[PDB]
């Protein structure tokens, strides 16, 4: 489990 | 006071005297208990048959409305002239009848349809051999287990016996339970397998972690109703798996309520085990059990793990869901709010995949049709009601975005559907992103390791524009046009005609973009299938109505029909020009034409009888080659009749004469087609 940036 | 905790008991006297007995009563007139079996081994016959030999444990273990036999040894044999006495089911420390917590068995002599009782169906010597039969509603937990002889001057009961307390789990085998599962292949899997597979990556580089849940370990079932006992979970709601499971996703995280896991992301994790390095269930509960202390640590899918583990072991039948780019809505508006990028104005986040709990269950509390998987989440992120849990919500509920129904299906839906709202605040929006958030949603395949996607479960295809009406429709639950829908008419082996009604009020001149989805339910609530969807759209002049009737043939519906279904329609409309929604949803059960089956004369197993069939039209049209088929495998061959035809609400009569070359109980089925209604059936048991 990880944050992802936004796009 | 609050009867919560399954550990705590009550003392039940063993001499209960009533009134002002006089010295020198001589109890020895009525019976006493010399010994009781439960028949409990693992080998025997109630834990095979009701799937509980695999239980580390040494106590009976059943599953509510099955019965189980048990059998009573008294010094004298049992007389019914003289004797009377029952069983007693006890849980908790403030037993009562009226809560479900004291269950007093008669003796009966059959039992009946989801009641308590016991039916003697063997007698030698002093003992007697007992079928009891449990309330398919009852309690889940751990009772204690009396015998009540009932004398004049009060009840003579056994004393307190560990060996014999027992277990009543839930049953997905028991079609009177809320949890019943009617797929074998389905029960092993979510219910038996006490191994399973969780899926993590990404959408194009997919990983695959084992876990062994070991919902039958020795220490699991008891720490699982500890883990209630620990929540103060009132003993009277624990047969209700809606409270079970909403119960479940507060308790197995530790916040808000000192349960089993913390969580944990700081990629330190000191003083505790890491995430990662956690392979199971097992370690984790039996150490909060010893210890009474939350477990450090978790993330995501070891709560998930967890929580699948206290599910399954209780019997309500569970999996594990992966949703790949999953939103996190920290302003419960259904929306990732972007403000641009600006990281200390924006708050909302994306996993890269997030793992949480399907449980399955009838919704007695939500209209038809939403029964089935219930999305459950035990991992922290936002309160439900002051506490850290989430849901059950309807994933059917989640798929055409009535989230208004409990619980906290507007969180779930923004989890798997949200938009990202790319916005500029300054002394506006920018970008609209509406297939990023939840790419894929996937679990464990039956029979074996592989993926199964059910993204279509949570959601439309994206591009669809049924998406953008649930998602419409989703922000709704949060232009003077009303809309309704009738069904027209509708008996099953017909066509039928669903009328969906507009009526402008207005001077204005609207467009509506719609959808339409129709439906197989169980009964009890429980979705089947889709077996029609249709989007259209209409013109709706000013200050008028207009009805959209649409056509569903029976060749739609028949082939998927069950017994007492009943079909489940959704219909959403937007005003394009005002951007409302209109969204109504409705149920309805099919008429169902009648065929009966009558025998003139003797049903014995050598000489010639008579079957009358008869049907009467139903329908208002003329039926046209109206076939009847006769079926009986040891009363006849098969035949048939035919009708050029049955004039509207008439009835026809055909006799047919048979001799059955078997005995025993056997039975008849009669059928009729025609060029239009088909496929109406009767039955009817007949013994040789
Ligand atoms: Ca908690
Ligand atoms: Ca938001
Ligand atoms: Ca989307």
Same mark, same amino acid.
């Given at each position: 489990x990880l944050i992802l940036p936004w796009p | 006071p609050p009867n919560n905790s399954n550990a705590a008991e009550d003392d039940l006297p063993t001499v209960e005297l009533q009134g002002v007995v006089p010295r020198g009563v001589n109890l020895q007139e009525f019976l006493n208990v010399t010994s009781v079996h439960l028949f409990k081994e693992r080998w025997?016959?109630?834990?095979?048959?009701?799937?509980?030999?695999?239980?580390?444990?040494?106590?009976?273990i059943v599953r509510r409305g099955q019965?189980?036999?048990?059998?009573?040894?008294?010094?004298? !044999?049992?007389?019914?002239?003289?004797?009377?006495?029952?069983?007693?089911?006890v849980i908790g420390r403030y037993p009562q009848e009226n809560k479900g917590t004291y269950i007093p068995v008669p003796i009966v002599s059959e039992l009946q349809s989801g009641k308590w009782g016991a039916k003697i169906v063997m007698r030698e010597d002093?003992?007697?051999?007992?079928?009891?039969?449990?309330?398919?509603?009852?309690?889940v937990g751990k009772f204690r287990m009396y015998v009540?002889?009932?004398? !004049?001057?009060?009840?003579?009961?056994?004393?307190?016996? !560990?060996?014999?307390?027992?277990?009543?789990?839930?049953n997905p085998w028991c079609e009177d339970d809320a949890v019943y599962l009617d797929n074998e292949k389905e029960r092993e899997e979510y219910v038996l397998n006490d191994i399973g597979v969780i899926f993590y990556g990404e959408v194009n580089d997919i990983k695959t972690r084992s876990w062994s849940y070991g919902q039958f370990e020795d220490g699991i079932l008891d720490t699982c109703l500890y883990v209630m006992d620990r929540a103060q979970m009132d003993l009277s709601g624990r047969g209700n798996p809606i409270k079970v499971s909403r119960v479940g996703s507060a308790m197995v995280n530790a916040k808000d309520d000192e349960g089993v896991l913390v969580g944990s992301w700081d990629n330190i994790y000191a003083y505790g085990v890491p995430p990662s390095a956690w392979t199971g269930s097992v370690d984790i509960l039996l150490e909060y059990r010893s210890s009474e202390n939350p477990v450090r640590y978790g993330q995501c899918w070891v709560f998930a793990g967890v929580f699948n583990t206290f599910l399954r072991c209780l019997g309500i039948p569970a999996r594990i869901v992966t949703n790949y780019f999953s939103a996190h809505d920290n302003d419960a508006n259904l929306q990732m709010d972007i403000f641009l990028v600006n990281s200390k104005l924006t708050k909302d986040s994306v996993w890269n995949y997030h793992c949480w709990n399907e449980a399955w269950m009838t919704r007695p509390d939500l209209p038809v049709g939403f029964g089935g998987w219930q999305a459950v989440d035990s991992?922290?992120?936002?309160?439900?009601?002051?506490?850290?849990?989430?849901?059950?919500?309807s994933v059917q509920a989640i798929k055409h975005g009535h989230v208004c129904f409990q619980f906290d299906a507007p969180f779930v839906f923004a989890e798997v559907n949200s938009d990202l709202i790319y916005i500029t605040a300054k002394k506006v929006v920018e970008n609209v992103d509406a297939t990023h958030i939840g790419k894929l949603i996937?679990?464990?395949?039956?029979?074996?390791?592989?993926?199964?996607?059910?993204?279509?479960?949570?959601?439309?295809?994206?591009?669809?524009?049924?998406?953008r009406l649930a998602l419409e429709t989703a922000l709704m639950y949060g232009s003077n046009v009303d809309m309704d829908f009738e069904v027209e008419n509708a008996v099953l082996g017909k066509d039928f005609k669903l009328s969906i009604t507009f009526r402008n009020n207005s001077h204005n001149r609207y467009t509506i973009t719609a959808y339409l989805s129709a439906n197989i339910t169980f009964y009890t609530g429980v979705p089947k299938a889709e077996f029609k969807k249709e989007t259209f759209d209409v013109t709706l002049e !000013?200050?008028?109505?207009?009805?959209?009737?649409?056509?569903?043939?029976?060749?739609?519906?028949?082939?998927?029909?069950?017994?007492?279904?009943?079909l489940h329609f959704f219909v959403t409309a937007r005003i394009n020009?005002?951007?409302?929604?209109?969204?109504?949803?409705?149920?309805?059960?099919?008429?169902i034409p009648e065929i009966i089956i009558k025998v003139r004369g003797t049903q014995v197993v050598g000489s010639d009888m008579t079957v009358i069939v008869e049907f009467t039209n139903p329908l208002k049209e003329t039926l046209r080659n109206v076939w009847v088929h006769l079926d009986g495998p040891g009363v006849t061959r098969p035949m048939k009749k035919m009708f050029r035809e049955i004039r509207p609400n008439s009835t026809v009569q055909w006799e047919e004469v048979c001799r059955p070359w078997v005995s025993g109980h056997r039975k008849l089925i009669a059928s009729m087609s025609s060029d239009s209604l088909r496929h109406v059936y009767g039955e009817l048991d007949v013994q040789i």
């Open positions: - | 025997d016959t109630n834990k095979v048959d009701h799937h509980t030999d695999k239980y580390e444990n040494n106590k009976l019965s189980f036999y048990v059998q009573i040894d008294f010094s004298r !044999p049992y007389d019914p002239r003289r004797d009377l006495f029952r069983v007693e089911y002093r003992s007697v051999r007992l079928s009891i039969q449990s309330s398919p509603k009852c309690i009540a002889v009932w004398t !004049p001057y009060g009840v003579l009961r056994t004393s307190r016996n !560990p060996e014999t307390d027992t277990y009543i789990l839930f991992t922290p992120q936002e309160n439900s009601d002051g506490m850290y849990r989430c849901g059950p919500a996937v679990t464990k395949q039956i029979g074996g390791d592989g993926m199964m996607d059910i993204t279509d479960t949570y959601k439309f295809q994206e591009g669809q524009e049924e998406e !000013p200050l008028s109505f207009k009805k959209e009737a649409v056509l569903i043939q029976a060749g739609e519906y028949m082939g998927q029909l069950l017994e007492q279904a009943s020009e005002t951007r409302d929604v209109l969204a109504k949803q409705k149920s309805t059960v099919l008429t």
